[PDB]
Scaffold this active site. Structure first.
Site, short mmCIF file in Angstrom:
data_model
loop_
_atom_site.label_atom_id
_atom_site.label_comp_id
_atom_site.label_asym_id
_atom_site.label_seq_id
_atom_site.Cartn_x
_atom_site.Cartn_y
_atom_site.Cartn_z
N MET A 46 33.33 -35.88 -0.96
CA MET A 46 33.76 -36.61 0.25
C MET A 46 35.30 -36.69 0.28
O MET A 46 35.95 -37.25 -0.63
CB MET A 46 33.13 -38.02 0.28
N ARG A 47 35.88 -36.13 1.34
CA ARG A 47 37.30 -35.78 1.34
C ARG A 47 38.12 -36.79 2.14
O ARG A 47 38.46 -36.58 3.29
CB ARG A 47 37.45 -34.35 1.86
N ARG A 48 38.40 -37.93 1.51
CA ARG A 48 39.13 -39.05 2.13
C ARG A 48 40.02 -39.69 1.10
O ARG A 48 39.78 -39.55 -0.08
CB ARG A 48 38.18 -40.11 2.68
#
Ligand SMILES: [Fe+3]
Length: 277
Positions: free
Chosen positions: A73-75
């Site tokens: 998850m790219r945050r």
């Protein structure tokens, strides 16, 4: 043979100018510089300043609370640990240090999203393309923005890839010492892609190739670390915005491999979801 990267004004393209050159460029290079598209150097410097302010002066506990939980998850941030720090955002589920950060970066993401939709809209019109469901449903999507910052001053070379995107928009700040990390293959050579005043760089990705039935090339490119001699004065940034389709977007698998794209799966068709999950 032909290794230059053209420049266009988006307003002029929308104005019907330069139609033939734009079509050629997409088919043969799939990349170009773009002015007059609702992005500015100044908006980039401010977004950049705020994030660097946090890198330098945020406390330890603040830095942990915005650090990304799982890189899948790219945050949030990566590499704040107190090569490069990274900050990623999507349309939701974002991680912000403060209220003003949230406001500036929400605005920056919105403008970048808007510029990208406008560019994609132009690429589809030039190739006479109507994706299934319509242009608007297709461009209202699942975009991702990734901003990288390389501090050190004031190693493994990786292989060129193509981007898994309809369109990718790239802004960068230059190196004091003149070093250019971004290179693409154009007409058989590796060409540098520097900071160019008041221009955003655009790459077409594989999705553009798929959706236009082969009329747009997705160029291979790589970003290069500096060598030992070119380290002094090599600080820099980039902002990269991937306009990615919705997970349920579908394509013919004959077509995909026929373009030269590593596809694990088999059958008549697939979604973008299973092409990366
Ligand atoms: Fe890339």
């Amino acid at each position: 043979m032909d290794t230059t990267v053209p420049t266009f004004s988006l307003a002029e393209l929308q104005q019907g100018l330069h139609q033939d050159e734009f079509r050629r460029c997409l088919r043969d290079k799939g990349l170009f510089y773009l002015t007059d598209c609702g992005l500015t150097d100044t908006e980039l410097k401010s977004a950049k300043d705020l994030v660097i302010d946090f890198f330098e002066h945020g406390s330890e506990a603040e830095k942990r609370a915005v650090t990304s939980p799982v890189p899948t998850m790219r945050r949030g941030f990566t590499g704040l640990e107190s090569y490069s720090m990274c900050y990623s955002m999507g349309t939701a589920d974002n991680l912000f240090p403060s209220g003003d950060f949230e406001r500036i970066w929400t605005q920056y993401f919105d403008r970048q999203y808007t510029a990208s939709r406008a560019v994609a809209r132009e690429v589809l019109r030039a190739t006479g393309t109507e994706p299934d469901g319509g242009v608007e449903a297709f461009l209202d999507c699942e975009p991702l923005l990734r901003f990288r910052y390389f501090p050190q001053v004031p190693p493994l070379r990786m292989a060129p890839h193509y981007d898994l995107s309809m369109v990718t928009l790239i802004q960068q700040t230059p190196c004091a010492n003149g070093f250019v990390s971004l290179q693409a293959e154009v007409g058989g050579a590796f060409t540098d892609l520097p900071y160019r005043p008041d221009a955003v760089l655009v790459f077409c990705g594989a999705i553009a190739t798929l959706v236009t039935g082969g009329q747009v090339k997705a160029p291979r490119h790589h970003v290069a670390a500096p060598r030992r001699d070119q380290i002094a004065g090599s600080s820099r940034t980039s902002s990269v915005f991937f306009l990615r389709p919705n997970a349920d977007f579908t394509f013919s698998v004959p077509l995909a491999r026929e373009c030269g794209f590593d596809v694990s799966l088999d059958g008549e068709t697939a979604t973008f979801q299973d092409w990366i999950g």
